[model samples]
Target: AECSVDIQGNDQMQFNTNAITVDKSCKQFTVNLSHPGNLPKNVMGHNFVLSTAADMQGVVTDGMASGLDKDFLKPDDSRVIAQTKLIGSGEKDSVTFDVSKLKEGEHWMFFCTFPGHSALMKGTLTLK
Candidate 1:
């Protein structure tokens, strides 16, 4: 199935699922996220950010300090090839990048950078 990735982040600071996989053949991937959590963005906003495993730390650091106005992400950060801006309860966002940009066997990941959310809301992504 395509365009189907429903997730939940609760008040306990956790995501329903911790791992997601992308097939190398997917041309356009769609991630549908909705926070069923009752918390606010400033408190527990959850976002899906994508980057290589090695670059995940760098991206998370810059994004965490990028401010909420920019969706808690560094504007024009090359390390990020795909991401969905910070979203709170009843809010959602999505990003689509070309599959060709991904290299087979390369490391990748999807995570949230909303302050402490990263601690429990991060996952590995494989472009295979």
Candidate 2:
């Protein structure tokens, strides 16, 4: 069964795709990210962060305090469903999470926690 997706980030601070679908048959879902820009991590880094829509802002706020080393995410933050390591141009990272953790009908979002990048680098996640 299919269980993986690929996303990309660029110097424009945007994700190539804005949403993803998870097959219920897959026990786990994977997110693979790529950055094809020329910027360095400090200037235009990107990462994949997933959480409930209600928790999006809180996650981004707390992530800023956690800094870049932690992938711009709070350490041991239970609100996070899944996350990928921060990366710069020409770099890539991926993460896999249990599909069972998702609740049917609940709204979820995937975004970048690199400071203000989420403003344009966010998307919805739909389960089926």
lDDT of 2 by residue, 39-121 (tens): 98888999899999999999999998999888899998999999998999899998999999899888999999999999999
Please write out the lDDT profile of model 1 over residues 11-128, one tens digit for every residue: 7778788787767668877677778877788888888888888988898898878888888899999998787878887787767778776787787777888877777887776654
Clashing pairs in 1: none
Q: How many residue pairs clash in each candidate?
A: 0, 0
lDDT of the candidates, in the order given? 0.78, 0.93
* Candidate 2 wrongly placed segments (more than 4 Å): none
Worst 10 residues of 2 by lDDT: 1-10
Q: Candidate 2: what lDDT?
A: 0.93
